[PDB]
Coordinates of C-alpha atoms and ligand atoms in Angstrom, one line a residue:
X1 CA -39.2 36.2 7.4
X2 CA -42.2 34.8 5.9
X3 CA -45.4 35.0 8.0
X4 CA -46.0 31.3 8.3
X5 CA -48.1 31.4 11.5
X6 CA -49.3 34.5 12.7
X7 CA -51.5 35.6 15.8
X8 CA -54.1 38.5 15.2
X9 CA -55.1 40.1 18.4
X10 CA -57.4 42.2 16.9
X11 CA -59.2 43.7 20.2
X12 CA -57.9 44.5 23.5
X13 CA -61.0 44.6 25.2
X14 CA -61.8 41.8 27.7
X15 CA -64.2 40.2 30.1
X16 CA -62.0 38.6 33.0
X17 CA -59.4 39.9 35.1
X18 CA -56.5 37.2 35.3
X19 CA -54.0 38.5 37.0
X20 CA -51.2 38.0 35.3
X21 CA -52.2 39.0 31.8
X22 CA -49.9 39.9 29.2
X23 CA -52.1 41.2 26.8
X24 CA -54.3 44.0 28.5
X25 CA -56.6 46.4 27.6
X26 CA -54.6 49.3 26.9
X27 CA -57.2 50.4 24.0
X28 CA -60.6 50.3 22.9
X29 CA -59.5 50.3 18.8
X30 CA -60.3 47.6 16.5
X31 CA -60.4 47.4 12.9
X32 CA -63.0 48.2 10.8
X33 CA -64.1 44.6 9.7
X34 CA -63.1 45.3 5.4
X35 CA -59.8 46.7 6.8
X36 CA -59.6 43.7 8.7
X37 CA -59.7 41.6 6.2
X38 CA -57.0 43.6 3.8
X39 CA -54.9 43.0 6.4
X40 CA -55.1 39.4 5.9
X41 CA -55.3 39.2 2.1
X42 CA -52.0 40.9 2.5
X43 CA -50.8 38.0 4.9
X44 CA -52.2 35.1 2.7
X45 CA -50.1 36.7 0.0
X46 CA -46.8 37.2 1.8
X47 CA -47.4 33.0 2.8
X48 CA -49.5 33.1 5.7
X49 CA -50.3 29.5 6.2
X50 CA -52.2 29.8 10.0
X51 CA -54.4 32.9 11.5
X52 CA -55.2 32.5 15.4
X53 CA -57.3 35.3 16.2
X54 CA -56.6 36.3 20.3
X55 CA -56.8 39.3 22.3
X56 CA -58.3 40.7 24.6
X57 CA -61.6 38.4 24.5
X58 CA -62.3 37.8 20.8
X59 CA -65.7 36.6 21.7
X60 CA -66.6 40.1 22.4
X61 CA -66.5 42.0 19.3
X62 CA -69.8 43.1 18.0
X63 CA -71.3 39.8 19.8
X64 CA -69.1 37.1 18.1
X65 CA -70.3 38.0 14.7
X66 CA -66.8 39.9 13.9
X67 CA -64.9 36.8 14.9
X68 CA -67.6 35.0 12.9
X69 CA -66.9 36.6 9.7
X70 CA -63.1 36.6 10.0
X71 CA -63.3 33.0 10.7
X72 CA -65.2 32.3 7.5
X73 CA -63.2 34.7 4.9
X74 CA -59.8 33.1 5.9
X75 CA -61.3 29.9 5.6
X76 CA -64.0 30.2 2.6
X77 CA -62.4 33.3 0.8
X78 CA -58.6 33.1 1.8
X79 CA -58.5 29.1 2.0
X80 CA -55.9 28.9 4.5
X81 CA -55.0 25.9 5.6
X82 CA -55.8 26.3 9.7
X83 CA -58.0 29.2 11.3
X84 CA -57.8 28.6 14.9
X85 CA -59.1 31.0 17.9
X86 CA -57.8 31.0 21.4
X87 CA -60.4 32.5 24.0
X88 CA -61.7 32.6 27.5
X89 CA -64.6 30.3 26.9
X90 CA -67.3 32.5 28.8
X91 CA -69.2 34.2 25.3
X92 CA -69.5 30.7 23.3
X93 CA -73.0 30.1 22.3
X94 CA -73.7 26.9 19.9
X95 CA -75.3 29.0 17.9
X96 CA -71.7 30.6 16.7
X97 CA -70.9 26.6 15.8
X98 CA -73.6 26.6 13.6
X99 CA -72.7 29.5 11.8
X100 CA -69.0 29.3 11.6
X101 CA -67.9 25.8 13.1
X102 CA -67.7 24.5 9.6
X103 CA -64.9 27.1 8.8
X104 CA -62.5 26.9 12.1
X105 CA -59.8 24.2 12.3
X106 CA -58.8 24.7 16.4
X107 CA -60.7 25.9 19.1
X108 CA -58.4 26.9 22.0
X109 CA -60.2 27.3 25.7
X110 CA -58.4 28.7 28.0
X111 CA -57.8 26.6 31.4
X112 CA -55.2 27.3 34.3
X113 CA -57.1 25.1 36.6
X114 CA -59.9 22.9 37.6
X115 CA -60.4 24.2 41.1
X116 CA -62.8 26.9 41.6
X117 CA -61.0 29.1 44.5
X118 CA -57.9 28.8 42.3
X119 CA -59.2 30.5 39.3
X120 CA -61.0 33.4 41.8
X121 CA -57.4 33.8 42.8
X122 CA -56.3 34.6 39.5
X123 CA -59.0 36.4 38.4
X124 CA -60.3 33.9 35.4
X125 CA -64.2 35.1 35.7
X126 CA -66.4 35.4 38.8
X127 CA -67.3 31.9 39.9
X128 CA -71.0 31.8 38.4
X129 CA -70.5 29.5 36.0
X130 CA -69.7 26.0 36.5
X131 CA -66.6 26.0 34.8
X132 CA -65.7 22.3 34.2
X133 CA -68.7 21.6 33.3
X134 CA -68.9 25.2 30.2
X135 CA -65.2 23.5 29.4
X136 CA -67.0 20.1 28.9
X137 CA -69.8 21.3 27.2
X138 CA -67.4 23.6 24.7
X139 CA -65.8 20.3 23.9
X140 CA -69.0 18.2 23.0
X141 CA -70.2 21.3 20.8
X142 CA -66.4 21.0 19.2
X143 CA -67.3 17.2 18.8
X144 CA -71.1 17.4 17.2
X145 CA -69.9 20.3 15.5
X146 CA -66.4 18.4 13.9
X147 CA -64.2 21.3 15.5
X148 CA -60.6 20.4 16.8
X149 CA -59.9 21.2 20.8
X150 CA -57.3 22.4 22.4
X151 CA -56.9 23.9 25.7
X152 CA -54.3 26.0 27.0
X153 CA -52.7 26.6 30.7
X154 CA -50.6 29.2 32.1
X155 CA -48.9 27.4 35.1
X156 CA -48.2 29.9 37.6
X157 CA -47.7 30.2 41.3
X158 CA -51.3 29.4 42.3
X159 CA -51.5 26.3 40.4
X160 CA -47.9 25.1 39.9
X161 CA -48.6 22.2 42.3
X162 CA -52.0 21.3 40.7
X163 CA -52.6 17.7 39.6
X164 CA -54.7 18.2 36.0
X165 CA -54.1 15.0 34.6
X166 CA -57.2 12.7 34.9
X167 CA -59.3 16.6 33.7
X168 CA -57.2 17.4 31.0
X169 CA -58.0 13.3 29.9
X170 CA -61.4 13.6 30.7
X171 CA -61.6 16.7 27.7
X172 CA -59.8 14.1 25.0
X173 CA -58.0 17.7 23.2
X174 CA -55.9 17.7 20.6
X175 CA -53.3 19.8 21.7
X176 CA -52.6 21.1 25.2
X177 CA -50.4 24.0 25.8
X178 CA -48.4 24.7 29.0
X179 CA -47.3 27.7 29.7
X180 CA -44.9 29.3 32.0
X181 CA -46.5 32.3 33.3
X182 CA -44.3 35.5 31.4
X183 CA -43.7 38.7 32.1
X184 CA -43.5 41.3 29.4
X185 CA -42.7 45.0 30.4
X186 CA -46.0 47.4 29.7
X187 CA -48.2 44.8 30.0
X188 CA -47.8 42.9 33.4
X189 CA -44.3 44.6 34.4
X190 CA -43.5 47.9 35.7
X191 CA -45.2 51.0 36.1
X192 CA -47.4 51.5 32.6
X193 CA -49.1 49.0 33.0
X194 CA -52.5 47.7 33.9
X195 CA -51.0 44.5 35.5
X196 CA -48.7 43.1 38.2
X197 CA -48.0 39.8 37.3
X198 CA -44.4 39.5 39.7
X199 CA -46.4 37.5 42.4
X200 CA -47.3 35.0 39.6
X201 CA -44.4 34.3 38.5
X202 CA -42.4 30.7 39.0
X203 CA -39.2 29.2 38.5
X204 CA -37.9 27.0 35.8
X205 CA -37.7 24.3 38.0
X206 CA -40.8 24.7 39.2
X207 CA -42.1 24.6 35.8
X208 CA -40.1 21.6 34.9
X209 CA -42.1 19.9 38.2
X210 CA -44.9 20.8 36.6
X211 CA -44.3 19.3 33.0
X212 CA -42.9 16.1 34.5
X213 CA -46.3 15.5 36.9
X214 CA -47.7 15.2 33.5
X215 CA -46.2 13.4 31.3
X216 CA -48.6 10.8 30.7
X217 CA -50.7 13.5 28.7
X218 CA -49.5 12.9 25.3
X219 CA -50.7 16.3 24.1
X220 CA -49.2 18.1 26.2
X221 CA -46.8 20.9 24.7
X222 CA -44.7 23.1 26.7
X223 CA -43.0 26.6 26.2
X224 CA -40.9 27.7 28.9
X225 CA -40.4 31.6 29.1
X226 CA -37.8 30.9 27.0
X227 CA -39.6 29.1 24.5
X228 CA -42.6 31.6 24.6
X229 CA -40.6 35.1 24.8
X230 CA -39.9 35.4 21.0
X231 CA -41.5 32.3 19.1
X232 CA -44.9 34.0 17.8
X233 CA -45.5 36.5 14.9
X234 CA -47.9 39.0 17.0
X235 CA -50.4 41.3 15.2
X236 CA -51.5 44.1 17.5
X237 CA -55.5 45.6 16.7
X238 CA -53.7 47.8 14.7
X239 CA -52.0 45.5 12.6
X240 CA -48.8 46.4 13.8
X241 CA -46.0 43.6 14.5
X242 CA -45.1 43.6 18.1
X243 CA -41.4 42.6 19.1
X244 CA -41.5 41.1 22.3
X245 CA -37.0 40.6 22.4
X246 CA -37.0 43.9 24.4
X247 CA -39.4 42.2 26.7
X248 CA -42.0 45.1 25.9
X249 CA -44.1 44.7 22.8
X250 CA -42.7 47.2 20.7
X251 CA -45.1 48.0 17.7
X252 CA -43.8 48.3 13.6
X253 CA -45.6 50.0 11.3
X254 CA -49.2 48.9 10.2
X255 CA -49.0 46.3 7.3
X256 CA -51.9 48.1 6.1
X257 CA -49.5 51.0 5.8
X258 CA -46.1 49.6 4.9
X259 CA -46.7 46.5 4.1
X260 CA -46.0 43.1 5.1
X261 CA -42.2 42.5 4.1
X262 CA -41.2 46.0 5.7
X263 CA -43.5 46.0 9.2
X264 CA -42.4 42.3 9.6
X265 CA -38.4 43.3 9.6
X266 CA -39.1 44.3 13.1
X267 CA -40.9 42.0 14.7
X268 CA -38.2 40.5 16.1
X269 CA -38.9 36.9 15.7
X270 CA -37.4 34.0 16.1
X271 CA -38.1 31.0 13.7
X272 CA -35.8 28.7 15.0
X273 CA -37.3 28.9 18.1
X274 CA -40.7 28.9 16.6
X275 CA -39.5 25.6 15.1
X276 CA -38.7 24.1 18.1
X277 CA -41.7 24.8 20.4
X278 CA -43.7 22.6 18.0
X279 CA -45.2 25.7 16.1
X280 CA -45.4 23.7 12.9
X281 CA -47.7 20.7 13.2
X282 CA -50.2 19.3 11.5
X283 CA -53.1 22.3 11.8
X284 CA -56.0 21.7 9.1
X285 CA -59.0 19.5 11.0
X286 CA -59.9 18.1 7.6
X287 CA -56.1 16.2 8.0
X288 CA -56.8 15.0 11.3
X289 CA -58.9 12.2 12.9
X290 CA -61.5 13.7 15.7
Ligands
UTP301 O1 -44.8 36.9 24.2 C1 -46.0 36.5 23.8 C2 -46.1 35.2 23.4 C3 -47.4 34.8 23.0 N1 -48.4 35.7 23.0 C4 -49.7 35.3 22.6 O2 -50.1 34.2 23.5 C5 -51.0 33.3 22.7 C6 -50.4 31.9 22.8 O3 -51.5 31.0 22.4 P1 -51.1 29.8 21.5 O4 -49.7 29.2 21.8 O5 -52.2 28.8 21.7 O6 -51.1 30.3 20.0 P2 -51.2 29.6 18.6 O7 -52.5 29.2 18.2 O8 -50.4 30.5 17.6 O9 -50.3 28.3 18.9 P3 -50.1 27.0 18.1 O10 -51.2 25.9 18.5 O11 -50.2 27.3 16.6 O12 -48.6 26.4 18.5 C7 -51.0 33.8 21.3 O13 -52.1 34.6 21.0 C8 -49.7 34.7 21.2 O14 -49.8 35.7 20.2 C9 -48.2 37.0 23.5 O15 -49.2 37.7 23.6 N2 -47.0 37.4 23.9
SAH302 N1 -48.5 36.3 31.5 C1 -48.8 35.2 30.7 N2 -47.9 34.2 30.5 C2 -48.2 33.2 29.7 N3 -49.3 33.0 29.0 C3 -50.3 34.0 29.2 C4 -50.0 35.1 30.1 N4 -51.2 35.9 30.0 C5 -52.0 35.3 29.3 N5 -51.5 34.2 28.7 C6 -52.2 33.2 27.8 O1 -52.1 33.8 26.5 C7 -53.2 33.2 25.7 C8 -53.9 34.4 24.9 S1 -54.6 35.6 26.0 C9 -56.0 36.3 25.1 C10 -56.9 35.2 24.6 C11 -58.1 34.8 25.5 N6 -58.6 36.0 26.2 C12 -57.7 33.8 26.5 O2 -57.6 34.0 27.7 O3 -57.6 32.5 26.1 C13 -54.2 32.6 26.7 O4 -54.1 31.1 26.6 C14 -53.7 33.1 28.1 O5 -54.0 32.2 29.1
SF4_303 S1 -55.6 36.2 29.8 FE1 -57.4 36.6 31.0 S2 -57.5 38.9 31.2 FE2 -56.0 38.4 29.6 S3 -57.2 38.6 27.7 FE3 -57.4 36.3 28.3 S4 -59.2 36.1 29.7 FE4 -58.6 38.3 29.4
CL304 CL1 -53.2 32.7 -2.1
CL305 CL1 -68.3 33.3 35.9
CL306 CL1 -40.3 24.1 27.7

């Protein structure tokens, strides 16, 4: 397996509640920054071609500034071709685009829905902000500051028969992921964990209803449960592969420990599916047209 595309969720801590999240805060570790970027020397050498940094709420790490400097040594230092972030949207100051816009390919916001009692319902912040209005003014700082935008959606049971057409337009992204809302044991499932994400849940043919109510959004790119289970190469804060085939995330040993080529044995991923989902597209800014 050769890390071609590989998400870093390098904290677990976080700032909203969403109900269904598969990624909780089940530690307060993070990397010393130098160790950090080891890590990812080692990557770039084993063929890393894309770093998303996730969580948790990467925003929150030492104010930004640890995101920051990741951002710019994979970019600057590493020169890998696509460094993108996926994040919550609520920490973004345009001061972080001044200092490391230049450096990040992708910016993906987070947005299950446009309506404000919807996303109290499932826990995405605590209705101070104006939310479509912080999502529209994330995407003009990604436009003066020549930064790709994406957004991403879990659809779930509170917003499975939402119409996001004409919003998801209005935001002109790049790339718009769907998501059916997943459950993965230790995280949102069963009794270790900090989430319940059952009542969330929707079938496959109510995702399909979904996907076909927009199909006249030609970014759109959706990943079933089945699509999503097993498609990602998952870094823990610890560096550790997770293996999400059990549906738990079982962790490998640290690359920063074993190595990349031994951890990675047991990540149990699947490229062909990784392949299929669209995981391989065209990623470096500097190669598209904003
Ligand atoms: O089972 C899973 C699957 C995915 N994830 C995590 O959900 C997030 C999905 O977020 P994205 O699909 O946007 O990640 P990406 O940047 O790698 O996507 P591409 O645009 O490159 O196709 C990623 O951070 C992934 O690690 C899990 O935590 N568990
Ligand atoms: N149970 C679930 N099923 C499918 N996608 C989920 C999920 N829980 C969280 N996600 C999605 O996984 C991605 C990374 S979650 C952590 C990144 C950041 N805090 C954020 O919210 O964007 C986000 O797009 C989030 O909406
Ligand atoms: S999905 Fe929600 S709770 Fe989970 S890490 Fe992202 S913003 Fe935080
Ligand atoms: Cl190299
Ligand atoms: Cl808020
Ligand atoms: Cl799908």
């Amino acid at each position: 397996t050769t890390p071609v595309s590989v998400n870093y969720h390098f904290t677990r801590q976080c700032n909203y509640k969403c109900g269904f999240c598969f990624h909780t805060a089940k530690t307060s570790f993070v990397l010393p920054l130098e160790e950090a970027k080891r890590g990812l020397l080692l990557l770039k050498q084993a063929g890393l071609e894309k770093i998303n940094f996730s969580g948790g709420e990467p925003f929150l790490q030492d104010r930004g500034e640890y995101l920051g400097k990741l951002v710019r040594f994979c970019k600057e230092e590493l020169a890998l071709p696509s460094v993108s972030i996926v994040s919550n949207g609520s920490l973004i100051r345009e001061r972080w685009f001044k200092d490391y816009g230049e450096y990040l390919d992708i910016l993906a916001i987070s947005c299950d829905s446009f309506d404000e009692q919807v996303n109290a319902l499932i826990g995405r912040g605590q209705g101070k902000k104006n939310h479509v209005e912080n999502l529209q003014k994330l995407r003009r700082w990604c436009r003066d500051y020549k930064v790709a935008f994406k957004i991403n959606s879990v659809i779930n049971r509170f917003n499975v028969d939402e119409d996001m057409n004409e919003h998801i337009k209005a935001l002109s992204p790049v790339r718009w992921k769907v998501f059916q809302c997943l459950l993965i044991e230790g995280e949102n499932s069963g009794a270790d964990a900090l989430r319940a994400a059952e009542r969330f849940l929707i079938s496959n043919e109510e995702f399909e209803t979904f996907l076909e109510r927009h199909k006249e959004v030609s970014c759109l790119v959706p990943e079933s449960n089945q699509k999503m289970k097993d498609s990602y190469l998952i870094l823990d804060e610890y560096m550790r592969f997770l293996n999400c085939t059990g549906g738990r995330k079982d962790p490998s040993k640290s690359i920063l420990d074993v190595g990349v080529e031994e951890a990675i044995k047991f990540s149990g991923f699947d490229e062909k599916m990784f392949l299929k989902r669209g995981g391989k597209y065209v990623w470096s800014k500097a190669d598209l047209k904003l």
